[PDB]
Design a protein around this nucleic acid. Structure first.
Ligand SMILES: [Mg+2]
Ligand SMILES: [Mg+2]
Ligand SMILES: [Mg+2]
Ligand SMILES: [Mg+2]
Ligand SMILES: [Mg+2]
Ligand SMILES: [Mg+2]
Ligand SMILES: [Mg+2]
Ligand SMILES: [Mg+2]
Ligand SMILES: [Mg+2]
Ligand SMILES: [Mg+2]
Ligand SMILES: [Mg+2]
Ligand SMILES: [Mg+2]
Ligand SMILES: [Mg+2]
Ligand SMILES: [Mg+2]
Ligand SMILES: [Mg+2]
Ligand SMILES: [Mg+2]
Ligand SMILES: [Mg+2]
Ligand SMILES: [Mg+2]
Ligand SMILES: [Mg+2]
Ligand SMILES: [Mg+2]
Ligand SMILES: [Mg+2]
Ligand SMILES: [Mg+2]
Ligand SMILES: [Mg+2]
Ligand SMILES: [Mg+2]
Ligand SMILES: [Mg+2]
Ligand SMILES: [Mg+2]
Ligand SMILES: [Zn+2]
Ligand SMILES: [Zn+2]
Ligand SMILES: [Zn+2]
Lengths: 81, 91, 93, 97, 88, 116, 25, 129, 150
RNA sequence: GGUGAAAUUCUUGGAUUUAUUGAAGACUAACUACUGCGAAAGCAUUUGCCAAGGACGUUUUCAUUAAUCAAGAACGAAAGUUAGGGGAUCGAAGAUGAUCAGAUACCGUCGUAGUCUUAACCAUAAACUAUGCCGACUAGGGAUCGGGUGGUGUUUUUUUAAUGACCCACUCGGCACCUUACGAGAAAUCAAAGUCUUUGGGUUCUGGGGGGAGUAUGGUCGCAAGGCUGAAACUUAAAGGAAUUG
């Protein structure tokens, strides 16, 4: 506000702003390894599937398409890495 | 090349009887000469003669119809509402 | 020049609004610009009930929406023409 | 629809269009289904249905004339009857049809 | 009971199923003093054996009414007066 | 049957959306009848939006089910058990049990019936 | 006079002038 | 479309000047932008700028001071014969004392005074005073 | 924006800063380029491949495991379709509004949007023609096109 | 009955009224809003079908494919024109009853065309925001519409969730409003009508005192009504705008 650091802004001010209106653009969308504990090696999904994914061996259903809340049907774990 | 701007088939009458009379004649003329689609065999082979008589080129069927078209508007609206009251007398 | 920025009433970004016709004179007026007053008055009201069955059961009233076209809104009903800066106040009272 | 499910046997399975080929398909048992246009005459219809019962083939009466049935099967001519000969990956023999 | 403007109506009958008469100057046909005056002889015959005009325009009780079955439409049957209404 | 001028015009508040639906339906009883139905929207009583409006996937889905349950008691009876069925009126929220999973929906009544 | 009545007065005028020399068509 | 990309950066600065504010992020930082912000700092109307590297077409932040009345882009990028640089300066520079009208020549983007030093000419870019 | 409207609504995707691999992804290049060609021959647009590989599998974006873009692999495996995928869809649209027009012949609206659709086709084609990816004789027509989708 | 008051008018034909009840065509009340959608015209009962669309979401695809646009084309309220149908309503014309000095009117009455629909025309509205389109920058404010993200927020209680609606915060894109004025303007007023004498982002279109006159003439479109294009001679010192006082 007539002196304001454009180069180093708060990691919270930019947390409020839009995906494209950050300082360097970046997707606020992650990936997840989802475990349905009826199978051993389970899959790595994208945060807004829009493809209700199914896993290697089973007919499982895990996901559902959405506006982006890619709803992880019946309850399972994950990790944003 | 396009032969006449307006008169189409009605040029045979030349200059006689007035634009309006000729224009209206052209309308039903175009109707009563054209090939229509046959309801029974699917080929565009029903032509007129002896107005109100419509016959398929192959499959040889004849349908009573309008004097220049197969179905008149009237006829079709009867068809519709005759179904209507019939569907009303079994259920 | 303009002497209201709304310059009708209450229509921005619609192009056309079906018209209503005025209670007083039947003149046609765009619904968005008809001054609307809902008249609810009820049906001398204890003479009603003493000499009568159902000892004050219900007591119902008129319910009715009214549309006047400026001209006749101005003649009697609530227009009461305002001043230049007094008119931007859209407080009902 | 089912035009959908039929349109998959053209690109996938084996078929035959036309009245005459369709009945050597119903004589050799090769047909598990035949689809019959709306307007195709009833004498022909009840004949096919006889050949169907003898092959124990199922039939489906396509709402829509043989003009429609032909542009359904992707052909540009009227088709009074179709006979599938392989249902390549369509479930048509396993849908409610 | 049914109240116009320049008349009011009142009439007994079986559930199954009085105007500008007691007054005559014909502007007074609505007037309450005559709604009453002819309501009187109405309750008379009531015991002698034992609605606005609405429809289209003004949807509202009349003067001689107090001294609901109002017909209201689904917004049709365009009103008299044109689009410029009665002009005075 | 009918509602009455008082009650119906008492119910249409501005700042909410009206909903009507009808169906013509049988009885045991060889009768075929057009019902009516009427419902509005409640402001959920923690709510600040002055105008309390649904957004019309709702109004379509609601008569969708109103008529599902409206022709699911009439032809579920004689006319006699029908008159017996709407007088306790709890069909009025035999709609609501459906609709509680979609919208607040105050003031649900059936409001007419009309026959041949 | 009103604008749109001057329009009418002129439309009339020219229909009349249009007529007058189709006499000499 | 953005057409004279230089302008949309240049004008933001001018807006960003009697804003009062003394930083501005500019979009999208072409090679011709940097070599224009550069010539201004060479004469002191802005301070330091920083080429942010999005993997996109770029971003600059220039921290600016209040010495500058009007920087400006002049174009369709008119062509100036060495004999009529002084007709521009006259038209669009307050006095013959100060202010430069930057421009593009074969010898590189350079202010009008350095051009009279180098005896080279080209098309006109803009101006700073 | 919105070349055939006045709706200025931006929504891009934010392509991340990291142009290298995501550094948590196990399979590399060969392992999954081999995967996209199994779906090309399946019959999928390079976008259906890009999405199905984005979510069901680890492939965050083609460009950076591969390094040819997706259409650029099908082109090398010979699986590049007759005409670019976007224009294909634009036609499939134009035909799909037309058959609706020619049966609802009294729809002024769809006729307007056929116009819009078709003149979008003509400008994209005009681009594809001048970049050699369409023959110079290439153009589009109501009756040539109804069999160009299928 | 009708109005300010009257009258033309309808009533042994039981009128106005009530009751049961049927026909026809038109329209979608109330809910309806500083709310939505469409390029604009414009769009408000239900359901099914038919294609279509913006915003959002997107670590998907293409990779400059775009902006604006003489010619040219799609649509285009109302009325109006041609061929059917329709013709309940209201209703240019016309005729009337009144008012007036007069009263072709305003008000009342009758009612033709029209009003509606199909097929074809016509292409104009104060078709208005009297305000070109794309891009950017410059300022505060709480509402609201659509999408979205965030939660040991409240409610449904079923037995708590799942849900649904509601609350709160932010962010995109909408319809608007509010306060300011840096700024602009001849002013009224304007987040653009600003970032202009410190005059240059791209591009289209129109205007050059007032009358004459959108007249004449030619060309062209139309069945017509008319649409587009569109002068001059002459005449004149004003005409006009916004604001101030009377
Ligand atoms: Mg004025
Ligand atoms: Mg308006
Ligand atoms: Mg308008
Ligand atoms: Mg009348
Ligand atoms: Mg007056
Ligand atoms: Mg002569
Ligand atoms: Mg020389
Ligand atoms: Mg454009
Ligand atoms: Mg943008
Ligand atoms: Mg998007
Ligand atoms: Mg309604
Ligand atoms: Mg030419
Ligand atoms: Mg009539
Ligand atoms: Mg007259
Ligand atoms: Mg007279
Ligand atoms: Mg007269
Ligand atoms: Mg007078
Ligand atoms: Mg005009
Ligand atoms: Mg306007
Ligand atoms: Mg504005
Ligand atoms: Mg003007
Ligand atoms: Mg703001
Ligand atoms: Mg916003
Ligand atoms: Mg000021
Ligand atoms: Mg000022
Ligand atoms: Mg001619
Ligand atoms: Zn699975
Ligand atoms: Zn035949
Ligand atoms: Zn009025």
């Amino acid at each position: 506000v007539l002196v304001q650091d454009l180069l180093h802004p708060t990691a919270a001010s930019e947390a409020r702003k839009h995906k494209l209106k950050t300082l360097v653009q970046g997707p606020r969308s992650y990936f997840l390894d989802v475990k349905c504990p009826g199978c051993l090696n389970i899959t790595t999904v994208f945060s807004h599937a829009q493809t209700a994914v199914t896993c290697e061996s089973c007919s499982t259903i895990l996901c559902t398409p959405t506006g982006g809340k890619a709803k992880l049907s019946e309850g399972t774990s994950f990790r944003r890495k | 090349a396009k032969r006449t701007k307006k008169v189409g088939i009605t040029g045979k009458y030349g200059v006689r009887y007035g634009s309006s009379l000729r224009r209206q004649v052209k309308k039903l003329e175009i109707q009563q000469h054209a090939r229509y689609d046959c309801s029974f065999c699917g080929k565009k082979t029903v032509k007129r003669g002896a107005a109100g008589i419509w016959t398929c080129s192959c499959c040889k069927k004849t349908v009573a119809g309008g004097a220049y078209t197969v179905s008149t508007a009237a006829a079709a609206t009867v068809r519709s509402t005759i179904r209507r009251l019939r569907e009303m007398v079994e259920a | 020049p303009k002497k209201r920025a709304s310059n009708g009433r209450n229509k921005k970004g619609r192009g056309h609004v079906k018209p209503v016709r005025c209670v007083n004179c039947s003149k046609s007026i765009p619904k968005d610009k008809a001054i609307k007053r809902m008249a609810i008055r009820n049906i001398a009201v204890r003479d009603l009930s003493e000499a009568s069955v159902y000892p004050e059961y219900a007591l119902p009233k008129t319910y009715n929406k009214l549309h006047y076209c400026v001209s006749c809104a101005i003649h009697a009903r609530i227009v009461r023409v305002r001043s230049r800066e007094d008119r931007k106040n859209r407080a009902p009272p | 629809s089912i035009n959908q499910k039929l349109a998959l046997v053209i690109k996938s399975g084996k078929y035959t269009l036309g009245y005459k080929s369709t009945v050597k398909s119903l004589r050799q048992g090769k047909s598990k289904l035949i689809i019959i246009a709306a307007n195709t005459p009833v004498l022909r219809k009840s004949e096919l249905e006889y050949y169907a019962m003898l092959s124990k083939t199922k039939v489906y009466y396509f709402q829509g004339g043989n003009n429609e049935l032909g542009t359904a099967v992707g052909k540009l001519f009227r088709v009074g009857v179709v006979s599938i000969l392989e249902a390549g990956d369509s479930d048509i023999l396993t849908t409610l049809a | 009971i049914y109240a116009s403007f320049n008349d009011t109506f009142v009439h007994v009958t079986d559930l199954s199923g009085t105007g500008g008469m007691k007054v005559k100057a014909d502007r007074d046909e609505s007037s309450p003093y005559a709604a009453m005056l002819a309501a009187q002889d109405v309750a008379a015959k009531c015991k002698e054996v034992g609605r606005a005009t609405g429809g289209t325009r003004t949807k509202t009780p009349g003067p001689g009414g107090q001294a609901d079955v109002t017909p209201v439409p689904s917004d049709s049957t365009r009103k008299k007066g044109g689009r410029r209404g009665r002009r005075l | 049957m009918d509602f009455t001028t008082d009650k119906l015009r008492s119910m249409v508040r501005k700042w909410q959306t009206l909903i009507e639906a009808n169906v013509t339906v049988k009885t045991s009883d060889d009768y075929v009848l057009r019902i009516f139905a009427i419902a509005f929207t409640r402001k959920q009583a923690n709510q600040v939006k002055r105008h309390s409006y649904a957004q019309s996937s709702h109004i379509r889905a609601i008569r969708k089910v109103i008529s599902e349950i409206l022709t699911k008691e009439v032809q579920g009876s004689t006319l006699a058990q029908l008159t017996s069925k709407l007088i306790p009126e709890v069909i009025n929220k035999e709609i609501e049990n459906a609709t509680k999973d979609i919208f607040p929906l105050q003031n649900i009544h059936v409001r007419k019936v009309k026959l041949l | 006079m009103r604008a749109k009545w001057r329009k009418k007065r002129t439309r009339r005028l020219k229909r009349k002038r249009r007529k007058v020399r189709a006499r000499s068509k | 479309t953005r057409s004279s990309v230089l302008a949309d950066a240049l004008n933001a600065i001018n807006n960003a000047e009697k804003t009062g504010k003394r930083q501005v992020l500019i979009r999208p930082s072409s090679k011709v932008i940097i070599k224009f912000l550069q010539v201004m700092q060479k004469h002191g109307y802005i301070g330091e700028f920083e080429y942010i590297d999005d993997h996109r077409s770029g971003k600059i932040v220039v921290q600016l001071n209040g010495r500058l009345n009007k920087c400006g882009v002049i174009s369709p990028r008119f062509n100036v014969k060495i004999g009529d640089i002084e007709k521009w300066t006259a038209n669009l520079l307050p006095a013959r004392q100060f202010g430069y009208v930057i421009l593009t020549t074969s010898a590189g983007i350079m202010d009008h005074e350095e051009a009279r030093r180098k005896h080279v000419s080209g098309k006109i870019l803009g101006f700073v005073y | 924006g919105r070349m055939h409207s006045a709706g200025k609504g931006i929504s891009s995707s934010a392509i991340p800063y990291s142009r290298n691999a995501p550094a948590w992804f196990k399979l590399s290049s060969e392992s999954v380029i081999e995967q996209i060609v199994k779906y090309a021959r399946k019959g999928l647009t390079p976008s259906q491949i890009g999405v199905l590989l984005r979510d069901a599998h680890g492939v965050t974006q083609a460009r950076v495991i591969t390094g040819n873009k997706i259409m650029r692999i099908l082109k090398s495996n010979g699986l590049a379709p007759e005409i670019p995928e976007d224009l294909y869809y634009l036609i499939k649209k134009a035909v799909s509004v037309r058959k609706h027009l020619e049966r609802n012949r009294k729809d002024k609206d769809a006729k307007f949007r056929l116009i819009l659709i078709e003149s979008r086709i003509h400008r994209l084609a005009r681009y594809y023609r001048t970049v050699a990816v369409l023959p110079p004789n290439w153009k589009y027509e109501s009756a040539t096109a109804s069999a160009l989708v299928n």
